[PDB]
Amino acid sequence: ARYTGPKTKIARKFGEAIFGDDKSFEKRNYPPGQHGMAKKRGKKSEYAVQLMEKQKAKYSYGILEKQFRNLFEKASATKGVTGEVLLQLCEARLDNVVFRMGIAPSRRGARQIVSHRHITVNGEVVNIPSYHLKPGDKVAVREKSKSLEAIERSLYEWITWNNDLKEGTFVSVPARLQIPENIKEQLIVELYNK
Amino acid sequence: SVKIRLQRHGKKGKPFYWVVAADARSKRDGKYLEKIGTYNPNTNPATVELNLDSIVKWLHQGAQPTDTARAILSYKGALLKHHLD
Amino acid sequence: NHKSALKRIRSNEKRRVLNRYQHKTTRNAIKALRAKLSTVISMIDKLAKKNIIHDNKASNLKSKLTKHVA
Amino acid sequence: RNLRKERIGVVTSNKMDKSIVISEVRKVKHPLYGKFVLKTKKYVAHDETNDCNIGDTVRISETRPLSKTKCWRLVEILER
Amino acid sequence: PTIQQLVRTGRTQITKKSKSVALDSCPQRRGVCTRVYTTTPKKPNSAMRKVARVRLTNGNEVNAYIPGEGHNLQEHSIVLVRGGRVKDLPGVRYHIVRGALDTSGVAGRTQRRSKYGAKRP
RNA sequence: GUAAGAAUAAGGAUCGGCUAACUCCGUGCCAGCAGCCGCGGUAAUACGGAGGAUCCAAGCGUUAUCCGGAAUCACUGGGUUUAAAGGGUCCGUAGGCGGUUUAGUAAGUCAGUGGUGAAAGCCCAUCGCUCAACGGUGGAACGGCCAUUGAUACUGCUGA
RNA sequence: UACGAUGAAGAGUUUGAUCCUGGCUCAGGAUGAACGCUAGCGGCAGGCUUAACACAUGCAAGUCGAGGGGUAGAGACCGGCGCACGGGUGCGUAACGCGUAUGCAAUCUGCCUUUCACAGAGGGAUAGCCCAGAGAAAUUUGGAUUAAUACCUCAUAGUAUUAUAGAGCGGCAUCACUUUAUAAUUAAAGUCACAACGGUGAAAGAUGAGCAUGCGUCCCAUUAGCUAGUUGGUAAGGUAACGGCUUACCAAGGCCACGAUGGGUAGGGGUCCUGAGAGGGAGAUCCCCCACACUGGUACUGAGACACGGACCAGACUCCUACGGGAGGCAGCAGUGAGGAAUAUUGGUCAAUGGACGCAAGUCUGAACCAGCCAUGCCGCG
């Protein structure tokens, strides 16, 4: 399933615009609710800190707790940095790459364009948002819905995107020092090892 | 009579057979003697992985192939090689 | 019961009467024989041929017979 | 041939006709505490002329079953 | 202690006696009630808790506690015991499922509807 | 592949501490709640209802049976003066342990080789189902056992 | 400043307050799960854990006319093969049952494969059919009778068996393999012609099936003695094969605190869950081994059974009856009643794979492949 709800609320309950720094991030930036607008609780537990740091990443991309735990224990099979490979495989998702390529300016629109047979991956059309893009994939756009109204309206360090043929040539898997995200993976690892 | 037959081991809808020599009094996909080859009729060429080093050995020891077994061992060899005395 | 089931109870009787006849005919001889020794060996070998007396056991009897007649 | 099993033991009692009984001791490691434990087992061997007595060190070999609970024979008497 | 003592007689592991025993290790058990009455807690609580003497299908007489408010529970009714003791009534070590075969649910309940067997309004 | 149409589709648990989330109304040790501490005797963040908030999500809670937390049967990995724990004290059988040097064997121990340790299953890598589940292939593993060839530092046996 | 190891969290609660020991509870994972609320799909997997309780009805093992007489207009019968496979359950069993490693110089082996030597003459019967019955039925009794790849005589055949007599090789004791004479004894089948399929004996291989052994095999010592064919031996009967397996005789042996015996429970393993690991808890679904087929016993046929859908006998249930007597066994698939908190269609097809028969065509296959029901679990999407 998906969230399918207010995104400004999710941005306010975390204090960080993860769906685009735009309207409503200011103008009562404090968390929502009749008791969040007032002086919140001062003492915040480390469990609350770790849980919210996990939920920030779980909400930014649109992953459920089940799939997030599956991906975490999948990435934990790598002998390297567990949080690093976790974030790498979370960024390697198809909808995330489509969102980073400029199309679908939000991930909520990425996981509505990728789930409509509007985008192709290495030839055959792949309409699975959770598709794991391995380094060295070729993402194109279906010629039927190539000249749409929203695609051209909406149109990184590792994505080589070409606007003439809707290219993007996903290669050179990025690292934590390159992926811009305000999340701490060590806290997520400690929470899942709790 | 030890026979050379096929064991189904694929998934529902897409079969995948093991060409294996086994006794006739055993279940289809259960006990066997020695795996010989492999048959995949999921592509147009109908891929096979026959082992002519043991196929002719079992045929000399007294194996008895079935219709599909002797049709797979036909266009992969070891039959025109088992005939040569 | 099956059609094949109502054929073995009928054929095995015709087999068993003959088997019992040929078995007792030589059992009485090997009993009241303990020289006409070369007359029950034929019956023992015929039983072994008919697979009644198991040629292994038949040879056991043949060896045990001509070992005390000496 | 195939070199059937062979054991080395100590005669325990000779009170039967043409048959002896020997005891064999082995040191096996404990499955939990890893301490070597001395475990015993008594075999029944076959003797012909009733030569060995209690307190000897014999060497037996496994053969066909010559009787119930008797499948060994003494071949290599070492010490008396 | 000593490795030789452990080799002789090892460590004795206990069986960890269970909690709910008179239900034959089943999640729920059907039963018939014989006496529905009210009891008092120990201390310092003060109430009138509703309990029922239930005879399970395996020939076991237990005391079950009726949760919530509103029920019929006549002198003979088919109930479904599930388990879960209470720290107020000495002897009552089982609970009755609300919404079972013959027992009633609850009316006017809107928060905890999965429990107490209440349909969605 | 073609043609209308956001249309045909979101609920459960929790909000005193453990543990993520607080305000009001009604009852006044009553009705009730409860995994433990325990709350309610008339200003209840703990009972019922309303609003808001948190978690999970086509699922959510309770029960029943297991492992972990439990170092709470402890070889790894606990203790016996006062918290549970030194026998009332000696002798001694079986058993457990063994001062120094030296010679022999190689039983324990160590190393190599051959056979076996079925297939399936777990893990790793790679391919086909649009991904995954699933399936194919390969390796590792199967901590084990039998035979044989060596080493002799330590334990066992024999001699001094 | 390398190597490998990707792995280890706590909290509440005794007191006016503190420390320590110590018990209870919670935070996680999992399930043949059940209940309450809720509910859109797809792929795949799973589905009586309790009464091995009782079953209405349908199907589940048949095939060969290229063995034979061949009838009505095919069926049925003799004969060959199969039915000992596949499928189901876990009652019983604490044990060479199972796992593991070997041995058989104490073993057998249909169908299958490869070689050698051959398939020559004869005969009496009897199925089916016909003539009469005795019976409600089941079923069964008389007479004369026609065939076979049915059965039975003689001759023939060895690297066949036995006995006596010479030998070589070789041990692991009993002895093992091969060769040579002599004596005795044991086979056949043909389908009118061809093709095609067959038959007998001997040897080797493969496969399958047995016996023995070392090690690991739950709890109770508020179970300390057990065993009398029992322990060993000498001769016979034997079994495929050694063996107290059985019998006759002699001796008193054999096991036991390193747990005999007795009682309770339980099919075993590869495996599943959990755990950092060492360990702990279970043995659904998949595969291998064992036991069973209403409760017990016994034997025949057959290479192979002391035989799920074969026989006989006894016992308890259900049914038919003319009261004399008879027919039964879903621990096979789909289903019914009961029990339980709880687990489904009286479905389709042999189209693939496997199995039986057949030279083949071909027949059967509730094995198997599909389909229906259950959000039961995993994954994916909305």
PDB file of N, CA and C (backbone and C1' of nucleotides) in Angstrom, chain G residues 65-92:
ATOM      1  P     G G  65      -4.810 -58.315 -28.582  1.00  0.00           P
ATOM      2  O5'   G G  65      -4.605 -59.400 -29.728  1.00  0.00           O
ATOM      3  C5'   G G  65      -4.118 -60.704 -29.426  1.00  0.00           C
ATOM      4  C4'   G G  65      -4.590 -61.722 -30.434  1.00  0.00           C
ATOM      5  C3'   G G  65      -5.200 -61.142 -31.708  1.00  0.00           C
ATOM      6  O3'   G G  65      -4.892 -61.995 -32.810  1.00  0.00           O
ATOM      7  C1'   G G  65      -6.799 -62.492 -30.613  1.00  0.00           C
ATOM      8  P     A G  66      -4.080 -61.421 -34.072  1.00  0.00           P
ATOM      9  O5'   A G  66      -2.585 -61.909 -33.827  1.00  0.00           O
ATOM     10  C5'   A G  66      -2.292 -63.281 -33.581  1.00  0.00           C
ATOM     11  C4'   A G  66      -0.988 -63.456 -32.840  1.00  0.00           C
ATOM     12  C3'   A G  66      -0.904 -62.747 -31.490  1.00  0.00           C
ATOM     13  O3'   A G  66      -0.108 -63.526 -30.598  1.00  0.00           O
ATOM     14  C1'   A G  66       0.800 -61.937 -32.910  1.00  0.00           C
ATOM     15  P     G G  67      -0.660 -63.886 -29.134  1.00  0.00           P
ATOM     16  O5'   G G  67      -1.064 -65.423 -29.242  1.00  0.00           O
ATOM     17  C5'   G G  67      -0.165 -66.377 -29.788  1.00  0.00           C
ATOM     18  C4'   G G  67      -0.345 -67.727 -29.144  1.00  0.00           C
ATOM     19  C3'   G G  67      -1.703 -68.382 -29.339  1.00  0.00           C
ATOM     20  O3'   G G  67      -1.831 -69.043 -30.586  1.00  0.00           O
ATOM     21  C1'   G G  67      -1.135 -68.461 -27.061  1.00  0.00           C
ATOM     22  P     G G  68      -3.246 -69.054 -31.346  1.00  0.00           P
ATOM     23  O5'   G G  68      -4.167 -69.975 -30.428  1.00  0.00           O
ATOM     24  C5'   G G  68      -3.828 -71.333 -30.189  1.00  0.00           C
ATOM     25  C4'   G G  68      -4.885 -72.034 -29.374  1.00  0.00           C
ATOM     26  C3'   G G  68      -6.314 -71.888 -29.867  1.00  0.00           C
ATOM     27  O3'   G G  68      -6.610 -72.744 -30.955  1.00  0.00           O
ATOM     28  C1'   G G  68      -6.246 -71.554 -27.529  1.00  0.00           C
ATOM     29  P     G G  69      -7.659 -72.282 -32.077  1.00  0.00           P
ATOM     30  O5'   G G  69      -9.044 -72.877 -31.568  1.00  0.00           O
ATOM     31  C5'   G G  69      -9.161 -74.253 -31.239  1.00  0.00           C
ATOM     32  C4'   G G  69     -10.299 -74.502 -30.283  1.00  0.00           C
ATOM     33  C3'   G G  69     -11.656 -73.967 -30.702  1.00  0.00           C
ATOM     34  O3'   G G  69     -12.312 -74.767 -31.671  1.00  0.00           O
ATOM     35  C1'   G G  69     -11.262 -73.387 -28.459  1.00  0.00           C
ATOM     36  P     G G  70     -12.539 -74.205 -33.163  1.00  0.00           P
ATOM     37  O5'   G G  70     -13.618 -73.044 -32.993  1.00  0.00           O
ATOM     38  C5'   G G  70     -13.220 -71.693 -32.790  1.00  0.00           C
ATOM     39  C4'   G G  70     -14.042 -71.038 -31.708  1.00  0.00           C
ATOM     40  C3'   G G  70     -15.114 -70.065 -32.171  1.00  0.00           C
ATOM     41  O3'   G G  70     -16.287 -70.713 -32.630  1.00  0.00           O
ATOM     42  C1'   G G  70     -13.914 -69.123 -30.367  1.00  0.00           C
ATOM     43  P     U G  71     -17.442 -69.870 -33.361  1.00  0.00           P
ATOM     44  O5'   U G  71     -18.463 -69.525 -32.189  1.00  0.00           O
ATOM     45  C5'   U G  71     -19.011 -70.553 -31.377  1.00  0.00           C
ATOM     46  C4'   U G  71     -19.936 -69.994 -30.328  1.00  0.00           C
ATOM     47  C3'   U G  71     -21.024 -69.061 -30.832  1.00  0.00           C
ATOM     48  O3'   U G  71     -22.138 -69.750 -31.375  1.00  0.00           O
ATOM     49  C1'   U G  71     -19.976 -68.096 -28.950  1.00  0.00           C
ATOM     50  P     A G  72     -23.120 -69.006 -32.407  1.00  0.00           P
ATOM     51  O5'   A G  72     -24.075 -68.144 -31.470  1.00  0.00           O
ATOM     52  C5'   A G  72     -24.847 -67.076 -31.999  1.00  0.00           C
ATOM     53  C4'   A G  72     -25.139 -66.039 -30.945  1.00  0.00           C
ATOM     54  C3'   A G  72     -25.655 -64.702 -31.452  1.00  0.00           C
ATOM     55  O3'   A G  72     -27.047 -64.709 -31.718  1.00  0.00           O
ATOM     56  C1'   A G  72     -23.914 -64.332 -29.902  1.00  0.00           C
ATOM     57  P     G G  73     -27.598 -64.330 -33.180  1.00  0.00           P
ATOM     58  O5'   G G  73     -26.950 -62.906 -33.484  1.00  0.00           O
ATOM     59  C5'   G G  73     -27.300 -61.764 -32.715  1.00  0.00           C
ATOM     60  C4'   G G  73     -26.263 -60.676 -32.847  1.00  0.00           C
ATOM     61  C3'   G G  73     -26.098 -60.081 -34.236  1.00  0.00           C
ATOM     62  O3'   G G  73     -27.071 -59.095 -34.536  1.00  0.00           O
ATOM     63  C1'   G G  73     -23.975 -60.610 -33.356  1.00  0.00           C
ATOM     64  P     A G  74     -13.912 -60.772 -29.968  1.00  0.00           P
ATOM     65  O5'   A G  74     -15.054 -59.791 -29.450  1.00  0.00           O
ATOM     66  C5'   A G  74     -15.077 -58.429 -29.849  1.00  0.00           C
ATOM     67  C4'   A G  74     -16.225 -57.683 -29.217  1.00  0.00           C
ATOM     68  C3'   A G  74     -16.335 -57.781 -27.704  1.00  0.00           C
ATOM     69  O3'   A G  74     -15.453 -56.905 -27.024  1.00  0.00           O
ATOM     70  C1'   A G  74     -18.457 -58.147 -28.670  1.00  0.00           C
ATOM     71  P     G G  75     -14.865 -57.317 -25.587  1.00  0.00           P
ATOM     72  O5'   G G  75     -16.165 -57.564 -24.702  1.00  0.00           O
ATOM     73  C5'   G G  75     -16.114 -58.400 -23.558  1.00  0.00           C
ATOM     74  C4'   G G  75     -17.480 -58.922 -23.187  1.00  0.00           C
ATOM     75  C3'   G G  75     -17.490 -60.102 -22.227  1.00  0.00           C
ATOM     76  O3'   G G  75     -17.337 -59.715 -20.873  1.00  0.00           O
ATOM     77  C1'   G G  75     -18.910 -60.574 -24.047  1.00  0.00           C
ATOM     78  P     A G  76     -16.069 -60.226 -20.028  1.00  0.00           P
ATOM     79  O5'   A G  76     -16.355 -61.778 -19.806  1.00  0.00           O
ATOM     80  C5'   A G  76     -17.497 -62.209 -19.080  1.00  0.00           C
ATOM     81  C4'   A G  76     -17.731 -63.690 -19.240  1.00  0.00           C
ATOM     82  C3'   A G  76     -16.531 -64.589 -18.990  1.00  0.00           C
ATOM     83  O3'   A G  76     -16.281 -64.820 -17.615  1.00  0.00           O
ATOM     84  C1'   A G  76     -17.586 -65.244 -20.991  1.00  0.00           C
ATOM     85  P     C G  77     -14.772 -64.992 -17.091  1.00  0.00           P
ATOM     86  O5'   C G  77     -14.313 -66.396 -17.688  1.00  0.00           O
ATOM     87  C5'   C G  77     -14.982 -67.594 -17.324  1.00  0.00           C
ATOM     88  C4'   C G  77     -14.400 -68.795 -18.024  1.00  0.00           C
ATOM     89  C3'   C G  77     -12.897 -68.979 -17.906  1.00  0.00           C
ATOM     90  O3'   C G  77     -12.486 -69.531 -16.670  1.00  0.00           O
ATOM     91  C1'   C G  77     -13.548 -69.308 -20.147  1.00  0.00           C
ATOM     92  P     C G  78     -11.029 -69.181 -16.092  1.00  0.00           P
ATOM     93  O5'   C G  78     -10.040 -70.098 -16.943  1.00  0.00           O
ATOM     94  C5'   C G  78      -9.981 -71.498 -16.720  1.00  0.00           C
ATOM     95  C4'   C G  78      -9.078 -72.194 -17.709  1.00  0.00           C
ATOM     96  C3'   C G  78      -7.610 -71.805 -17.678  1.00  0.00           C
ATOM     97  O3'   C G  78      -6.882 -72.420 -16.632  1.00  0.00           O
ATOM     98  C1'   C G  78      -8.354 -71.842 -19.911  1.00  0.00           C
ATOM     99  P     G G  79      -5.668 -71.637 -15.924  1.00  0.00           P
ATOM    100  O5'   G G  79      -4.760 -71.136 -17.135  1.00  0.00           O
ATOM    101  C5'   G G  79      -3.863 -72.022 -17.788  1.00  0.00           C
ATOM    102  C4'   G G  79      -3.047 -71.318 -18.846  1.00  0.00           C
ATOM    103  C3'   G G  79      -2.204 -70.146 -18.376  1.00  0.00           C
ATOM    104  O3'   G G  79      -1.003 -70.542 -17.740  1.00  0.00           O
ATOM    105  C1'   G G  79      -3.339 -69.546 -20.352  1.00  0.00           C
ATOM    106  P     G G  80      -0.362 -69.618 -16.593  1.00  0.00           P
ATOM    107  O5'   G G  80       0.272 -68.398 -17.394  1.00  0.00           O
ATOM    108  C5'   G G  80       1.333 -68.605 -18.314  1.00  0.00           C
ATOM    109  C4'   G G  80       1.840 -67.304 -18.882  1.00  0.00           C
ATOM    110  C3'   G G  80       2.052 -66.176 -17.889  1.00  0.00           C
ATOM    111  O3'   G G  80       3.262 -66.298 -17.164  1.00  0.00           O
ATOM    112  C1'   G G  80       0.931 -65.349 -19.799  1.00  0.00           C
ATOM    113  P     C G  81       3.346 -65.788 -15.643  1.00  0.00           P
ATOM    114  O5'   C G  81       3.324 -64.200 -15.769  1.00  0.00           O
ATOM    115  C5'   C G  81       4.359 -63.512 -16.456  1.00  0.00           C
ATOM    116  C4'   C G  81       4.033 -62.052 -16.640  1.00  0.00           C
ATOM    117  C3'   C G  81       3.680 -61.278 -15.382  1.00  0.00           C
ATOM    118  O3'   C G  81       4.815 -60.902 -14.622  1.00  0.00           O
ATOM    119  C1'   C G  81       2.137 -60.751 -17.088  1.00  0.00           C
ATOM    120  P     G G  82       4.703 -60.776 -13.024  1.00  0.00           P
ATOM    121  O5'   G G  82       3.758 -59.512 -12.801  1.00  0.00           O
ATOM    122  C5'   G G  82       4.189 -58.209 -13.164  1.00  0.00           C
ATOM    123  C4'   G G  82       3.050 -57.219 -13.141  1.00  0.00           C
ATOM    124  C3'   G G  82       2.386 -56.989 -11.794  1.00  0.00           C
ATOM    125  O3'   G G  82       3.107 -56.098 -10.964  1.00  0.00           O
ATOM    126  C1'   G G  82       0.728 -57.299 -13.441  1.00  0.00           C
ATOM    127  P     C G  83       3.272 -56.411  -9.398  1.00  0.00           P
ATOM    128  O5'   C G  83       1.799 -56.248  -8.813  1.00  0.00           O
ATOM    129  C5'   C G  83       1.143 -54.989  -8.836  1.00  0.00           C
ATOM    130  C4'   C G  83      -0.341 -55.124  -8.598  1.00  0.00           C
ATOM    131  C3'   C G  83      -0.760 -55.643  -7.232  1.00  0.00           C
ATOM    132  O3'   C G  83      -0.739 -54.644  -6.226  1.00  0.00           O
ATOM    133  C1'   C G  83      -1.955 -56.797  -8.902  1.00  0.00           C
ATOM    134  P     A G  84      -0.574 -55.051  -4.679  1.00  0.00           P
ATOM    135  O5'   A G  84       0.790 -55.871  -4.633  1.00  0.00           O
ATOM    136  C5'   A G  84       2.020 -55.272  -5.030  1.00  0.00           C
ATOM    137  C4'   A G  84       3.051 -55.337  -3.932  1.00  0.00           C
ATOM    138  C3'   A G  84       4.476 -54.984  -4.356  1.00  0.00           C
ATOM    139  O3'   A G  84       5.150 -54.363  -3.261  1.00  0.00           O
ATOM    140  C1'   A G  84       4.428 -57.192  -3.531  1.00  0.00           C
ATOM    141  P     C G  85       5.000 -52.784  -3.001  1.00  0.00           P
ATOM    142  O5'   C G  85       5.042 -52.143  -4.459  1.00  0.00           O
ATOM    143  C5'   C G  85       6.271 -51.995  -5.155  1.00  0.00           C
ATOM    144  C4'   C G  85       6.113 -51.123  -6.374  1.00  0.00           C
ATOM    145  C3'   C G  85       5.545 -49.735  -6.130  1.00  0.00           C
ATOM    146  O3'   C G  85       6.509 -48.813  -5.653  1.00  0.00           O
ATOM    147  C1'   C G  85       4.424 -50.724  -7.953  1.00  0.00           C
ATOM    148  P     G G  86       6.143 -47.800  -4.459  1.00  0.00           P
ATOM    149  O5'   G G  86       5.029 -46.849  -5.085  1.00  0.00           O
ATOM    150  C5'   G G  86       5.331 -45.987  -6.173  1.00  0.00           C
ATOM    151  C4'   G G  86       4.078 -45.493  -6.851  1.00  0.00           C
ATOM    152  C3'   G G  86       3.091 -44.750  -5.965  1.00  0.00           C
ATOM    153  O3'   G G  86       3.438 -43.393  -5.753  1.00  0.00           O
ATOM    154  C1'   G G  86       1.932 -46.373  -7.212  1.00  0.00           C
ATOM    155  P     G G  87       3.419 -42.778  -4.268  1.00  0.00           P
ATOM    156  O5'   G G  87       1.895 -42.891  -3.821  1.00  0.00           O
ATOM    157  C5'   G G  87       0.892 -42.115  -4.459  1.00  0.00           C
ATOM    158  C4'   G G  87      -0.482 -42.417  -3.916  1.00  0.00           C
ATOM    159  C3'   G G  87      -0.676 -42.228  -2.421  1.00  0.00           C
ATOM    160  O3'   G G  87      -0.848 -40.876  -2.036  1.00  0.00           O
ATOM    161  C1'   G G  87      -1.604 -44.289  -3.061  1.00  0.00           C
ATOM    162  P     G G  88      -0.225 -40.355  -0.647  1.00  0.00           P
ATOM    163  O5'   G G  88      -1.115 -41.064   0.469  1.00  0.00           O
ATOM    164  C5'   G G  88      -2.503 -40.785   0.578  1.00  0.00           C
ATOM    165  C4'   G G  88      -3.156 -41.591   1.675  1.00  0.00           C
ATOM    166  C3'   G G  88      -2.574 -41.433   3.069  1.00  0.00           C
ATOM    167  O3'   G G  88      -3.013 -40.251   3.719  1.00  0.00           O
ATOM    168  C1'   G G  88      -2.943 -43.725   2.620  1.00  0.00           C
ATOM    169  P     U G  89      -2.053 -39.499   4.764  1.00  0.00           P
ATOM    170  O5'   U G  89      -2.107 -40.411   6.068  1.00  0.00           O
ATOM    171  C5'   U G  89      -3.312 -40.563   6.803  1.00  0.00           C
ATOM    172  C4'   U G  89      -3.200 -41.656   7.835  1.00  0.00           C
ATOM    173  C3'   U G  89      -2.117 -41.478   8.887  1.00  0.00           C
ATOM    174  O3'   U G  89      -2.504 -40.612   9.941  1.00  0.00           O
ATOM    175  C1'   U G  89      -2.030 -43.678   8.037  1.00  0.00           C
ATOM    176  P     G G  90      -1.395 -39.793  10.766  1.00  0.00           P
ATOM    177  O5'   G G  90      -0.627 -40.908  11.607  1.00  0.00           O
ATOM    178  C5'   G G  90      -1.306 -41.682  12.591  1.00  0.00           C
ATOM    179  C4'   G G  90      -0.400 -42.709  13.228  1.00  0.00           C
ATOM    180  C3'   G G  90       0.691 -42.144  14.136  1.00  0.00           C
ATOM    181  O3'   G G  90       0.922 -43.047  15.216  1.00  0.00           O
ATOM    182  C1'   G G  90       1.685 -43.379  12.386  1.00  0.00           C
ATOM    183  P     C G  91      -0.112 -43.119  16.443  1.00  0.00           P
ATOM    184  O5'   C G  91      -0.956 -44.436  16.149  1.00  0.00           O
ATOM    185  C5'   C G  91      -2.139 -44.725  16.880  1.00  0.00           C
ATOM    186  C4'   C G  91      -2.350 -46.212  17.017  1.00  0.00           C
ATOM    187  C3'   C G  91      -1.262 -46.972  17.757  1.00  0.00           C
ATOM    188  O3'   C G  91      -1.385 -46.886  19.167  1.00  0.00           O
ATOM    189  C1'   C G  91      -1.793 -48.113  15.760  1.00  0.00           C
ATOM    190  P     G G  92      -0.083 -46.660  20.082  1.00  0.00           P
ATOM    191  O5'   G G  92       0.806 -47.957  19.823  1.00  0.00           O
ATOM    192  C5'   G G  92       0.364 -49.241  20.239  1.00  0.00           C
ATOM    193  C4'   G G  92       1.182 -50.338  19.604  1.00  0.00           C
ATOM    194  C3'   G G  92       2.657 -50.366  19.972  1.00  0.00           C
ATOM    195  O3'   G G  92       2.898 -51.019  21.207  1.00  0.00           O
ATOM    196  C1'   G G  92       2.421 -50.571  17.627  1.00  0.00           C
TER     197        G G  92
END
